[PDB]
Write a protein that binds this ligand. Structure first.
Ligand SMILES: CCCCCCCCCCCC[N+](C)(C)[O-]
Ligand SMILES: CCCCCCCCCCCC[N+](C)(C)[O-]
Ligand SMILES: CCCCCCCCCCCC[N+](C)(C)[O-]
Ligand SMILES: CCCCCCCCCCCC[N+](C)(C)[O-]
Ligand SMILES: CCCCCCCCCCCC[N+](C)(C)[O-]
Lengths: 86, 183, 183, 183, 183, 86
């Protein structure tokens, strides 16, 4: 039982960790560009998209490795919990 | 007078003074406040003082405890970190309890950290414990090891007398007479 | 007087002075505050001082601990980094405990870091330990290795006497008399 | 006087001085502060000085450590990088421990970096170690290799005496007398 | 006086002086600060000095090290780049270690870069090593090849004595007497 | 797995450079037409859209040949890697 609760909790915890950094940078870029467009009055609306695409892709390059190490370790763990009973 | 050390802490200074006095070296402690303490000696004793500071590696480094590496200021901490803080607090509480037993002056305790492979799916491993203690002079150490083992055995859920190591020692001779002043 | 070294710290200066005094070279330590300490010697001794500085590779590098490679202020910590800081703190706490035993002056301890594999897939492997220590003159070293081994064995979940190496040595002769001043 | 070198650091300067004095060349060290140290010699000795500077390739390069290539103060660190910094710290901590043995003046240690494969999906290779050391004159080198091998074997989870290389050498003759001044 | 070269570095100028002196050409080194060093010779020696500058291809280019091709600070690195920085550091560390062996003056090391292919899904090839070294006069080279082979063999996970090439040479005659000035 | 690493990283780099050019053109046009409305102090919704459409269509008429070269090259390359072992 507690193994079930633990594994289910951890799933949500990993979602949170992995998704957190891209969504942070997409937020910060959204705020900065929105402010800049009030500091100098320009009514463009694709500029956020153009910048935040580069912003998100860059950090996907950076974190490409840790993403695979975390998921491998988790998969091995849950396969053990499922099968290794005696 | 020649300067040996500057900017010491109070508990560094008293240790240095103690070790110099033991070898018959008269030393002086001076307080500069925000600059800390300074230690000075006479020239005839300078050579010896230097050699002893080398041999004992003074001033002492601060005391290490595992909870310092997992500050609990995290956003969130893994099971591994929580289980470490827990064990590191039990070690300190046991050392403080032993210091209350009859005639013990000081002690040190160590516990096997099962945390090394906590949370890899595998079951936990039995615990091991080690203790050091210092006694007053004229104590029957052999008869006193039993009490310590007995006390430690039931502090943990699964411990065997075979898994408890205890090392005891007596206090050294008292340093009561003052050192002689250089001629 | 000729300048050997400048901008030293307090530990570096005292280690230099100790090694020079041992070879009968009278040296002088000067404090410049924000600029640190300076070491000077007489001309007749300059050549020798240079040769010994080279041979001992003074001033010493600062002391190395594994935790320095994994700062906790990082954006991310993996399990490998967490277990590295754990072992790096247990080693230090054992050295600090051995310094308290009867008649020991200093010691060093090493543990087998199995963390260089993730402890994943493959089951973990047993621990190995090594120790070095220095003793007061007149110590029966052969009879004292047993105590150390006994104490270390129970500090971990799985250790065999076969897997514990211990090396002991005695303190050198004391340097008490001051060196002679050049004519 | 002719200028050989300018803007040297303290360690480079003292190295150059030591090498020249060994060959009977009187040299002088001058301090320009933020511009570093300068080395000068007499004209009769200029030719020889140049030839020895070439032959030894002075001034010496800074010392190389593997962790310099994988700085920890970086935004993200691949597993290969972390697995590299760990070994590059263990190497240094073993060197620093060897220097504390009785009669040793300096040492170098090398470990087989199995990180040059990830060994994912693969069995990990065994470890190999190599060590170099310099001893004081009158040391029984033959009988001292055993201690080192014993000490190193237990530093790592799986090591065979056959995989440990040890090379020892004695200190050269001491340079105590000063060189003669040109007439 | 005729100008041979301008804007030299310190360590280029010293090499040029050394090579001209060896062939009996008296040369002069001048410092212009931000403009570097200048080298001058007499007219009777001008022709010869130009012939030797051509023949030796002076002034020398700086040393090449593989890490210069793969800076640590690019935004991203493929595994190949990291692996190349790693071996590019191990080479330099072994060179610096060999220079401490008894009576070695300088050395060079080369490692087989397997990194130029993945060896993925495939057996990674064994390593190969080459070394060059220069010795003080009167060294038994035949007896000294063994030491270097023994030392390098254990520096890596899998190396055979068959796969290690070693080339040794003695130092040339010493240039102690100064060249003659034109009449 | 140097092959999986390569194919995975290149896919993302190709997305980033294939998409960047149209969005850059659209953003620069957007800014200039937004400015001109300010210096003229004259305002309407439709002028920027109208010009943006033309700008992107010209961008595609020009570059599209190169899009084909890049995609064919990648298409062959991945197949050869998949069937490389034999
Ligand atoms: C619009 C992009 C959505 C991407 C969602 C998946 C993110 C992980 C991508 C794989 C890991 C990073 N990388 C660079 C190798 O691609
Ligand atoms: C969408 C989650 C993040 C992308 C990574 C998904 C896992 C891909 C497989 C990882 C393989 C790791 N590797 C190459 C070391 O084996
Ligand atoms: C273009 C968006 C989707 C791209 C998906 C690429 C998947 C790559 C899977 C492997 C990621 C982990 N890695 C690089 C260590 O292998
Ligand atoms: C608004 C249309 C969006 C189409 C997206 C795909 C554009 C590239 C492929 C079509 C190229 C057509 N072209 C220029 C060859 O004629
Ligand atoms: C109206 C939008 C139509 C988009 C798709 C057009 C057909 C694909 C492009 C075919 C030509 C490709 N090209 C330029 C490389 O030859």
């Amino acid at each position: 039982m507690d193994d079930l609760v633990f594994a289910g909790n951890k799933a949500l915890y990993l979602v949170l960790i992995l998704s957190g950094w891209p969504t942070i940078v997409a937020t910060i870029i959204g705020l900065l560009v929105g402010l800049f467009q009030t500091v100098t009055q320009l009514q463009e609306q694709t500029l956020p998209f153009g910048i935040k695409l580069l912003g998100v892709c860059l950090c996907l390059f950076l974190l490409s490795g840790w993403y695979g190490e975390v998921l491998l370790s988790y998969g091995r763990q849950v396969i053990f919990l499922a099968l290794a009973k005696g | 007078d020649k300067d040996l050390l500057k900017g010491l802490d109070q508990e560094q200074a008293n240790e240095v003074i103690a070790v110099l006095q033991m070898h018959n070296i008269e030393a002086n402690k001076i307080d500069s406040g925000k600059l800390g303490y300074s230690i000075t000696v006479a020239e005839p004793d300078f050579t010896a003082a230097v050699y002893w500071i080398k041999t004992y590696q003074l001033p002492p480094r601060p005391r290490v405890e595992i909870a310092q590496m997992f500050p609990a200021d995290s956003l969130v901490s893994s099971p591994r970190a929580e289980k470490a803080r827990l064990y590191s607090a039990i070690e300190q509480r046991l050392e403080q309890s032993l210091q209350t037993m009859e005639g013990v002056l000081s002690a040190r305790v160590h516990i096997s950290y099962d945390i090394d492979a906590g949370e890899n799916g595998r079951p936990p491993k039995p615990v091991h414990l080690s203790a050091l203690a210092v006694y007053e002079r004229g104590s029957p150490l052999a008869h006193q090891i039993s009490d310590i083992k007995r006390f430690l055995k039931n502090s943990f859920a699964d411990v065997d007398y075979d898994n408890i190591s205890v090392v005891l020692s007596e206090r050294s001779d008292a340093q009561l007479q003052a050192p002689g002043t250089p001629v």
